[PDB]
Design a protein around this motif. Structure first.
Motif, PDB file in Angstrom:
ATOM      1  N   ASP A  66      15.316  13.303   6.958  1.00  0.00           N
ATOM      2  CA  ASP A  66      16.121  11.807   7.170  1.00  0.00           C
ATOM      3  C   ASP A  66      17.311  12.174   7.243  1.00  0.00           C
ATOM      4  O   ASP A  66      18.333  11.602   8.041  1.00  0.00           O
ATOM      5  N   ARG A  67      17.982  12.877   6.378  1.00  0.00           N
ATOM      6  CA  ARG A  67      19.443  13.144   6.126  1.00  0.00           C
ATOM      7  C   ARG A  67      20.046  13.967   7.311  1.00  0.00           C
ATOM      8  O   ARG A  67      21.245  13.820   7.729  1.00  0.00           O
ATOM      9  N   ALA A  68      19.087  14.999   7.404  1.00  0.00           N
ATOM     10  CA  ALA A  68      19.695  15.988   8.471  1.00  0.00           C
ATOM     11  C   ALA A  68      19.687  15.426   9.767  1.00  0.00           C
ATOM     12  O   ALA A  68      20.596  15.210  10.664  1.00  0.00           O
ATOM     13  N   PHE A  69      18.601  14.474  10.186  1.00  0.00           N
ATOM     14  CA  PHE A  69      18.586  13.781  11.437  1.00  0.00           C
ATOM     15  C   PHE A  69      18.388  12.421  11.289  1.00  0.00           C
ATOM     16  O   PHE A  69      17.029  12.188  11.772  1.00  0.00           O
ATOM     17  N   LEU A 125      33.256   4.003  29.668  1.00  0.00           N
ATOM     18  CA  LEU A 125      33.510   4.014  28.354  1.00  0.00           C
ATOM     19  C   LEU A 125      32.292   4.208  27.417  1.00  0.00           C
ATOM     20  O   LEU A 125      32.295   5.152  26.596  1.00  0.00           O
ATOM     21  N   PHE A 126      31.190   3.842  27.924  1.00  0.00           N
ATOM     22  CA  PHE A 126      30.011   3.753  27.306  1.00  0.00           C
ATOM     23  C   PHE A 126      29.514   5.278  27.037  1.00  0.00           C
ATOM     24  O   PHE A 126      29.250   5.986  25.941  1.00  0.00           O
ATOM     25  N   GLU A 127      29.720   5.987  28.207  1.00  0.00           N
ATOM     26  CA  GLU A 127      29.625   7.497  28.481  1.00  0.00           C
ATOM     27  C   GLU A 127      30.378   8.189  27.292  1.00  0.00           C
ATOM     28  O   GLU A 127      29.876   8.951  26.495  1.00  0.00           O
ATOM     29  N   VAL A 128      31.764   7.999  27.444  1.00  0.00           N
ATOM     30  CA  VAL A 128      32.645   8.516  26.358  1.00  0.00           C
ATOM     31  C   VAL A 128      32.063   8.139  24.856  1.00  0.00           C
ATOM     32  O   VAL A 128      32.162   9.169  24.046  1.00  0.00           O
ATOM     33  N   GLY A 129      32.052   6.871  24.870  1.00  0.00           N
ATOM     34  CA  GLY A 129      31.593   6.692  23.451  1.00  0.00           C
ATOM     35  C   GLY A 129      30.475   7.216  23.034  1.00  0.00           C
ATOM     36  O   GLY A 129      30.180   7.816  21.614  1.00  0.00           O
ATOM     37  N   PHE A 130      29.125   7.348  23.775  1.00  0.00           N
ATOM     38  CA  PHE A 130      27.860   8.221  23.296  1.00  0.00           C
ATOM     39  C   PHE A 130      28.562   9.726  22.898  1.00  0.00           C
ATOM     40  O   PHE A 130      27.914  10.320  22.149  1.00  0.00           O
ATOM     41  N   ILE A 131      29.032  10.185  23.760  1.00  0.00           N
ATOM     42  CA  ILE A 131      29.719  11.736  23.752  1.00  0.00           C
ATOM     43  C   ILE A 131      30.327  11.876  22.190  1.00  0.00           C
ATOM     44  O   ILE A 131      30.093  12.497  21.495  1.00  0.00           O
ATOM     45  N   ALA A 132      31.120  11.079  22.115  1.00  0.00           N
ATOM     46  CA  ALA A 132      31.938  11.124  20.624  1.00  0.00           C
ATOM     47  C   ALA A 132      30.979  10.754  19.567  1.00  0.00           C
ATOM     48  O   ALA A 132      31.155  11.409  18.633  1.00  0.00           O
ATOM     49  N   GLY A 133      30.182   9.876  19.750  1.00  0.00           N
ATOM     50  CA  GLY A 133      29.221   9.626  18.693  1.00  0.00           C
ATOM     51  C   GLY A 133      28.207  10.851  18.407  1.00  0.00           C
ATOM     52  O   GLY A 133      28.181  11.167  17.254  1.00  0.00           O
ATOM     53  N   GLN A 134      27.741  11.456  19.252  1.00  0.00           N
ATOM     54  CA  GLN A 134      26.853  12.624  19.371  1.00  0.00           C
ATOM     55  C   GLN A 134      27.847  13.663  18.467  1.00  0.00           C
ATOM     56  O   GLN A 134      27.601  14.500  17.642  1.00  0.00           O
ATOM     57  N   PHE A 136      30.559  13.523  16.345  1.00  0.00           N
ATOM     58  CA  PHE A 136      30.763  13.207  15.114  1.00  0.00           C
ATOM     59  C   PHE A 136      29.360  13.258  14.217  1.00  0.00           C
ATOM     60  O   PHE A 136      29.507  13.348  13.080  1.00  0.00           O
ATOM     61  N   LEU A 137      28.431  12.609  14.800  1.00  0.00           N
ATOM     62  CA  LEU A 137      27.165  12.772  14.111  1.00  0.00           C
ATOM     63  C   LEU A 137      26.544  14.360  13.897  1.00  0.00           C
ATOM     64  O   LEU A 137      26.280  14.660  12.788  1.00  0.00           O
ATOM     65  N   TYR A 138      26.509  15.047  14.978  1.00  0.00           N
ATOM     66  CA  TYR A 138      25.831  16.371  14.967  1.00  0.00           C
ATOM     67  C   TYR A 138      26.935  17.647  15.737  1.00  0.00           C
ATOM     68  O   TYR A 138      26.778  18.671  15.447  1.00  0.00           O
ATOM     69  N   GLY A 139      27.954  17.142  16.225  1.00  0.00           N
ATOM     70  CA  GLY A 139      28.427  18.429  16.808  1.00  0.00           C
ATOM     71  C   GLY A 139      27.676  18.996  17.906  1.00  0.00           C
ATOM     72  O   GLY A 139      27.042  18.062  18.703  1.00  0.00           O
ATOM     73  N   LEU A 145      19.611  26.387   9.212  1.00  0.00           N
ATOM     74  CA  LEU A 145      19.587  26.262   7.879  1.00  0.00           C
ATOM     75  C   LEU A 145      20.187  24.914   7.494  1.00  0.00           C
ATOM     76  O   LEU A 145      21.342  24.666   8.171  1.00  0.00           O
ATOM     77  N   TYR A 146      19.785  23.996   6.733  1.00  0.00           N
ATOM     78  CA  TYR A 146      20.170  22.554   6.284  1.00  0.00           C
ATOM     79  C   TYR A 146      20.072  22.599   4.797  1.00  0.00           C
ATOM     80  O   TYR A 146      18.814  22.814   4.408  1.00  0.00           O
ATOM     81  N   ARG A 147      21.260  22.743   4.127  1.00  0.00           N
ATOM     82  CA  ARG A 147      21.223  22.521   2.698  1.00  0.00           C
ATOM     83  C   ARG A 147      21.028  20.962   2.097  1.00  0.00           C
ATOM     84  O   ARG A 147      22.003  20.332   2.661  1.00  0.00           O
TER      85      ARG A 147
HETATM   86  C1  MC3 Z   1      30.711  -1.052  20.697  1.00  0.00           C
HETATM   87  C2  MC3 Z   1      30.927   0.126  20.095  1.00  0.00           C
HETATM   88  C3  MC3 Z   1      30.828   0.156  18.517  1.00  0.00           C
HETATM   89  C4  MC3 Z   1      31.232   1.359  17.694  1.00  0.00           C
HETATM   90  C5  MC3 Z   1      30.985   1.253  16.280  1.00  0.00           C
HETATM   91  C6  MC3 Z   1      31.388   2.758  15.602  1.00  0.00           C
HETATM   92  C7  MC3 Z   1      31.262   2.549  14.143  1.00  0.00           C
HETATM   93  C8  MC3 Z   1      31.665   3.877  13.210  1.00  0.00           C
HETATM   94  C9  MC3 Z   1      31.321   3.380  11.600  1.00  0.00           C
HETATM   95  C10 MC3 Z   1      32.077   4.293  11.045  1.00  0.00           C
HETATM   96  C11 MC3 Z   1      31.569   4.712   9.721  1.00  0.00           C
HETATM   97  C12 MC3 Z   1      31.757   5.967   9.035  1.00  0.00           C
HETATM   98  C13 MC3 Z   1      31.231   6.286   7.533  1.00  0.00           C
HETATM   99  C14 MC3 Z   1      29.821   7.258   7.944  1.00  0.00           C
HETATM  100  O1  MC3 Z   1      29.226   7.389   8.705  1.00  0.00           O
HETATM  101  O2  MC3 Z   1      29.523   7.916   6.898  1.00  0.00           O
HETATM  102  C15 MC3 Z   1      29.466   9.325   6.999  1.00  0.00           C
HETATM  103  C16 MC3 Z   1      28.061   9.627   7.690  1.00  0.00           C
HETATM  104  C17 MC3 Z   1      27.885  11.065   7.934  1.00  0.00           C
HETATM  105  O3  MC3 Z   1      28.158  11.819   6.613  1.00  0.00           O
HETATM  106  P1  MC3 Z   1      28.795  13.544   6.753  1.00  0.00           P
HETATM  107  O4  MC3 Z   1      30.164  13.377   6.755  1.00  0.00           O
HETATM  108  O5  MC3 Z   1      28.591  14.054   5.276  1.00  0.00           O
HETATM  109  O6  MC3 Z   1      28.210  14.277   7.931  1.00  0.00           O
HETATM  110  C18 MC3 Z   1      26.777  14.053   8.367  1.00  0.00           C
HETATM  111  C19 MC3 Z   1      25.941  15.127   8.501  1.00  0.00           C
HETATM  112  N1  MC3 Z   1      24.600  14.656   8.862  1.00  0.00           N
HETATM  113  C20 MC3 Z   1      24.567  14.207  10.523  1.00  0.00           C
HETATM  114  C21 MC3 Z   1      23.534  15.753   8.916  1.00  0.00           C
HETATM  115  C22 MC3 Z   1      24.059  13.509   8.217  1.00  0.00           C
HETATM  116  O7  MC3 Z   1      27.722   9.205   8.901  1.00  0.00           O
HETATM  117  C23 MC3 Z   1      28.458   9.381   9.893  1.00  0.00           C
HETATM  118  O8  MC3 Z   1      29.555   9.984   9.934  1.00  0.00           O
HETATM  119  C24 MC3 Z   1      27.907   9.374  11.337  1.00  0.00           C
HETATM  120  C25 MC3 Z   1      28.756   8.244  12.209  1.00  0.00           C
HETATM  121  C26 MC3 Z   1      27.808   8.101  13.280  1.00  0.00           C
HETATM  122  C27 MC3 Z   1      28.560   7.099  14.456  1.00  0.00           C
HETATM  123  C28 MC3 Z   1      27.661   7.045  15.612  1.00  0.00           C
HETATM  124  C29 MC3 Z   1      28.366   5.968  16.676  1.00  0.00           C
HETATM  125  C30 MC3 Z   1      27.738   5.621  17.780  1.00  0.00           C
HETATM  126  C31 MC3 Z   1      28.468   4.977  18.889  1.00  0.00           C
HETATM  127  C32 MC3 Z   1      27.529   4.692  20.094  1.00  0.00           C
HETATM  128  C33 MC3 Z   1      28.693   3.940  21.150  1.00  0.00           C
HETATM  129  C34 MC3 Z   1      27.595   3.305  22.243  1.00  0.00           C
HETATM  130  C35 MC3 Z   1      28.604   2.223  22.819  1.00  0.00           C
HETATM  131  C36 MC3 Z   1      27.765   1.494  23.965  1.00  0.00           C
END
Ligand code: MC3
Ligand code: MC3
Ligand code: MC3
Ligand code: MC3
Ligand code: MC3
Ligand code: MC3
Ligand code: MC3
Ligand code: MC3
Ligand code: MC3
Ligand code: MC3
Ligand code: MC3
Ligand code: MC3
Ligand code: MC3
Lengths: 194, 194, 194, 194, 194, 194
Positions: A66-69, A125-134, A136-139, A145-147
């Motif tokens: 759950d924490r990894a994905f 906008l949506f496309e760019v946003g999903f790209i960036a979210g991907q 920041f979430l995973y690279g 390996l996941y610790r």
């Molecule tokens: C209308 C548009 C609204 C956009 C709203 C954006 C809201 C952003 C909130 C920012 C809060 C950041 C705090 C946070 O999140 O705490 C850090 C935590 C990750 O912890 P970590 O640094 O240890 O690495 C994680 C390693 N791990 C993946 C294995 C777990 O969570 C993360 O950073 C993961 C953040 C994932 C963001 C996903 C954004 C999806 C945007 C979709 C846009 C769709 C448009 C239609």
């Protein structure tokens, strides 16, 4: 899944759209929906089954997966497809409404022009946003390996992921498809303006 | 599952409905039915398989999963879809009956107006009701840990859930979709009255 | 499963049936067939896999599941659907035969009236019968614990069922749907007589 | 499985067949094909997975399941359906050939009469034959316990079957359906002769 | 699998083919494709899962299953179907090409005759070839026991196969179907020559 | 997967393409898409489940399967199909655009000729490229044994693959199909030039 309804709506969109828009829809159907159905969903079938953690602690594998994905990649791509598609449905509905109104009383200008441009904008906008979210979430590289140090795991445990290389390949493939979609939206804007 | 029959009926409803109603039906098909089929049903596939309890007691995992999740979320959403859809079928049937009667002898007024408004009303009530039931049963955050004290479990046992974060995400997504449906019903009422 | 053939036949029945009959068929398709396909079949997927008995005796779980659940619920509902549907097919066939005969030579009276009423009768009887059989076989509450004393089980063993609460919910849902079908048949009789 | 092709051919047979023949085809599609797809195939899903033998001998469960169930019931019913259907295809082909010949140059008599009667005959024979084979191979009651003495099993081992009661129920259901088919063929002969 | 495309092509072949050819295509669709989809694929579902070897050597079961069954039977039949079908597609394409040419400018003679005969020839050869390959690879009886001496297996190990009797039955069934196809090709040649 | 959309597009391509192109598309649909769906996907179903490594180290099987099979073969073939198909879609779109333009105002020359030739070129290049990539990644023989020295594996571990012989057979089959496609593109070029 079953994309037939959306398929029909987007075919109707093809009936009323620019050539570059038709290319965009064909890309959507062939390189994103089809690839997910035929290929990607089978790569992520055993994402949690073949996720192994070196521990004897009950519940550590679950919380560490759950924490990894937090959200799976395939699900994220599903949502991306839906959202990038929605504007096209909005524009198609505007079009059908104007057609019905003409029928009541008794080809891209006025409201249709603006609404189409806005559609383009939102898709981008949506496309760019999903790209960036991907990113920041995973690279864009899934390490084997996941610790994990989440309770109930004692100290830090090592956990191992299924098919990291194949998943990495498909991540990059879908990212490139998204960038192609962006280029197509840009080209459509340029065509309109000139 | 197979939603084709309902699909046909609701397409016919689109043939006879307000523009906002068409938006509502498109939302229903794309953001609720499709999302369940493509995405959510795969998140909840291993809900009980990957549900782990720290005990050596036979039967404790079963009763603790039953107490944690009396009805599964996906099933609840299925029922929600059916129920919010039913009024539309009622209105469509009223319409077809009036058409058949006209044919026997030899466009929203009288009985159709009232019946449509009532449809709106019921859709709204059912939606709100399911929302509230979901809240009182689960809330909108699925915690990873569930502590269970149900027989045959000795004292209190710790149990761990599969994919709590992903499930939480989809819970909120579907709640937001339901709120959008509510806004659409309100807008339809306003359009009628003005 | 695949209900398309039956679907076509019952759509043809809708072409030739009373309004209340159309409501009955819509109920059949939406609240019984669809619910089984989308929801119930996934609740009963692991009925025997997640059926756990506290014993080390080979073969005790098998015989205890067989004694607890002689016929599964979902299968029973499948048979119920088929049987309640059959009369409608009989009436539809009578109708098509009369149409073909008229064609050879060169709208509910005479034989069609009687045959339709009898259809109603049989549908009602079958429904009531399945309801009562369900009650006498299982009741309407599936308890989590089942105590089994069938050979090869030594003395009495405790056995635990998967998803008793969810199954209980769906049992009651389908019972209520059946009672609604009964009310509809009664209303159809009343409409005919008056 | 996929019965669509056969479905089309047998619908065409309905276009050219007696009323009792139409009843027979409807029985075939609803009470045999549909029941297998929706219900029976899920009863026999875990026939070998949940087949348990009380031994520690490798390979004894496999050979004992093979000796207990040489051909599975569902497969036997599949073959029964195919074979009882074939004559109808033969008659339909004779019919289409005569139609094509008439077309070249420029309603049950002569060759069509004989060929149809023979079809009836063969359907009956095949049905009776499968019934008798089923009886001699398994009877009509599937006992929970099966005692096996086949190599590599040491002495006689006890083995236990999954869902014996449910399987018994469906065996009898399909036997009754077959007897109904026989009655229908007899009625068709009588109708022809008188 | 999905045979719809091939289905359409072979239906078109039926539009342009001899009566015996139509019988051949009906045999292909009912007794080979359908039997594989409905019945055989479920017999071979657990071919490797329920393949048990009496050893504690890692990797011996895998290599012994690979040596026992280099290509699975069902896959071999799939390839057989494709290959025996191809000639028919070639002939159909020749036909459509001649039709298009006639259309450009402004019923079995000349090139069509020869090409059809050659089609027959190839179908026969391929069929016989697959039959013989099946014989030399497996014979027509699948013994329950397989003795394996392939590395990493120490000395000779005993291994046991799932469902040998049922598989044997279906092997013979498909062989008989192939021989019927051969008889049909011979009859078609005879009909042409006389 | 679901190839229906692509199926429709490539059927339209058949409407507007050379005879050799039609042969190419038929090869694509029958010998590559169909073979994957019916046969190959079932060979690679247990690629990682039945992948066994002789070790007691957690995570060694996962990383050793990832190193042995970075991308699975079936997925690689899926991508190959998509990419070799794309040019045909481009040419079809050029054609439909010219048709629409003619319609606005009020058969292979000019732009269509060049674009078609280029399509051929790209199809060839992509095909050759995938072939070579397959060779350099795997070769054309899948050995049963794979020796792995990737962390966390201690020293070098022996690992064993599921169904190496069957996979080898299908690898060569698909390679031969690709070479046939190449020959067809060459023949199409020759036909054009002469
Ligand atoms: C209308 C548009 C609204 C956009 C709203 C954006 C809201 C952003 C909130 C920012 C809060 C950041 C705090 C946070 O999140 O705490 C850090 C935590 C990750 O912890 P970590 O640094 O240890 O690495 C994680 C390693 N791990 C993946 C294995 C777990 O969570 C993360 O950073 C993961 C953040 C994932 C963001 C996903 C954004 C999806 C945007 C979709 C846009 C769709 C448009 C239609
Ligand atoms: C409809 C539009 C949807 C847009 C959705 C955007 C979603 C952005 C999610 C950002 C999550 C950050 C998580 C995090 O905290 O992990 C990074 C930390 O360390 C850091 O990098 C701190 C700096 C983080 C900078 C993040 C910049 C985001 C810009 C988004 C622009 C979107 C344009 C459409
Ligand atoms: C026509 C409309 C009829 C509406 C009828 C409403 C009937 C309400 C009955 C009220 C009885 C309350 C007593 C009760 O239920 O005992 C408490 C027990 C929960 O125990 P707990 O507090 O420990 O937390 C539970 C934590 N756990 C989730 C892990 C288990 O059960 C719960 O509260 C769960 C209650 C769930 C209510 C679901 C309502 C669905 C409404 C659908 C409406 C559809 C309209 C078409
Ligand atoms: C067609 C309409 C369907 C409506 C369905 C409504 C279902 C409400 C279920 C309520 C379950 C309560 C369970 C419980 O007992 O757990 C809370 C306790 O502690 C407490 O909160 C005690 C106070 C609980 C207040 C509950 C207010 C419910 C209002 C429902 C309004 C629905 C409007 C349509
Ligand atoms: C044309 C209409 C023909 C109707 C024919 C009705 C025939 C009735 C035969 C009566 C024999 C009773 C003796 C008997 O059965 O011995 C008792 C034994 C149950 O033992 P138990 O008391 O320990 O509790 C069982 C607890 N356990 C469920 C966990 C196992 O079996 C049971 O009672 C279960 C009985 C289940 C009856 C199911 C009837 C289905 C009707 C369908 C109608 C469809 C119309 C188209
Ligand atoms: C087409 C019509 C189909 C009708 C199917 C009816 C099936 C009835 C099954 C009865 C099984 C009894 C099992 C049993 O022996 O367990 C109860 C004992 O202890 C007792 O209750 C002893 C008294 C049992 C009374 C049972 C009354 C059944 C009335 C059926 C009426 C159906 C009307 C259509
Ligand atoms: C054109 C028509 C041709 C019909 C040809 C009929 C050929 C009959 C051959 C007779 C040989 C008998 C010798 C024999 O078979 O040795 C006995 C052995 C059973 O041993 P067991 O007594 O210990 O009990 C078995 C208990 N166990 C089921 C757990 C294993 O095998 C059995 O009896 C099982 C025999 C099963 C016969 C199945 C016949 C299917 C007919 C289909 C007709 C379709 C028409 C289109
Ligand atoms: C197209 C027609 C297909 C017909 C298929 C018939 C299949 C009969 C299979 C018989 C297997 C016997 C196995 C056996 O040996 O187990 C019984 C022993 O002990 C005994 O019963 C010894 C006496 C056995 C008498 C068997 C009489 C069979 C009559 C078949 C009539 C079929 C008419 C169409
Ligand atoms: C199309 C014509 C319809 C034909 C319907 C055929 C129904 C056949 C019923 C067969 C029951 C066999 C029970 C049995 O031999 O097992 C043996 C076991 C000892 O005795 C037991 O445990 C008995 C436990 C209680 C069993 C209750 C089963 C009720 C199923 C009703 C299904 C109704 C569907 C129409
Ligand atoms: C255009 C036509 C081209 C035809 C080309 C034919 C090529 C024949 C090559 C001959 C080489 C023989 C050497 C050999 O193969 O070494 C022996 C080895 C079997 O070893 P074993 O004796 O211990 O028994 C095996 C027991 N076990 C099954 C458990 C493993 O392999 C075998 O014999 C198995 C041989 C299987 C042959 C399959 C031929 C398929 C033909 C399809 C035709 C399609 C036409 C469109
Ligand atoms: C398009 C035509 C496709 C034809 C495909 C034919 C495939 C033949 C495969 C032969 C594999 C032999 C494997 C083997 O070596 O195992 C037998 C050894 O011991 C022996 O039997 C040594 C003698 C083996 C004689 C084999 C004769 C094959 C004749 C094929 C005729 C095909 C006519 C179309
Ligand atoms: C537009 C066209 C762009 C083409 C771009 C080509 C880029 C080539 C990059 C060259 C880098 C080589 C370095 C390298 O890769 O390090 C060696 C490493 C293998 O290590 P190894 O020697 O120990 O054996 C591996 C044994 N094992 C399979 C079990 C793991 O990786 C390998 O060689 C595997 C290389 C696989 C290459 C796949 C190419 C696919 C081309 C598709 C073209 C599609 C056109 C539309
Ligand atoms: C659209 C066109 C797509 C073309 C895709 C080509 C992909 C080539 C991948 C090459 C991976 C090499 C991996 C490696 O390093 O493993 C071999 C080492 O040892 C060696 O062999 C060192 C020499 C390696 C020579 C590789 C020659 C590749 C020629 C590709 C020509 C493609 C024409 C279309």
């Amino acid at each position: 899944g079953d994309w037939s309804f959306l398929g029909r709506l987007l075919e109707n969109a093809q009936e009323h759209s620019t050539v570059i828009g038709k290319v965009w829809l064909t890309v959507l159907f062939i390189f994103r929906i089809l690839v997910l159905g035929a290929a990607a969903e089978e790569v992520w079938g055993d994402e949690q089954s073949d996720f192994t953690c070196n521990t004897q602690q009950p519940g550590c594998e679950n919380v560490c997966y759950d924490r990894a994905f937090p959200i799976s990649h395939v699900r994220f791509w599903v949502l991306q497809i839906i959202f990038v598609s929605t504007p096209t449905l909005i524009y198609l509905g505007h079009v059908l409404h104007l057609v019905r109104m003409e029928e009541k009383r008794k080809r891209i200008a006025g409201a249709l022009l603006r609404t189409y441009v806005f559609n383009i904008i939102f898709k981008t906008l949506f496309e760019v946003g999903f790209i960036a979210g991907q990113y920041f979430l995973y690279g864009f590289q899934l390490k084997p390996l996941y610790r994990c140090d989440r309770w109930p795991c004692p100290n830090t445990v090592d956990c191992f992921i299924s098919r990291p290389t194949e998943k990495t390949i498909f991540i990059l493939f879908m990212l490139a498809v998204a960038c192609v979609s962006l280029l197509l939206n840009v080209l459509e804007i340029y065509h309109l303006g000139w």
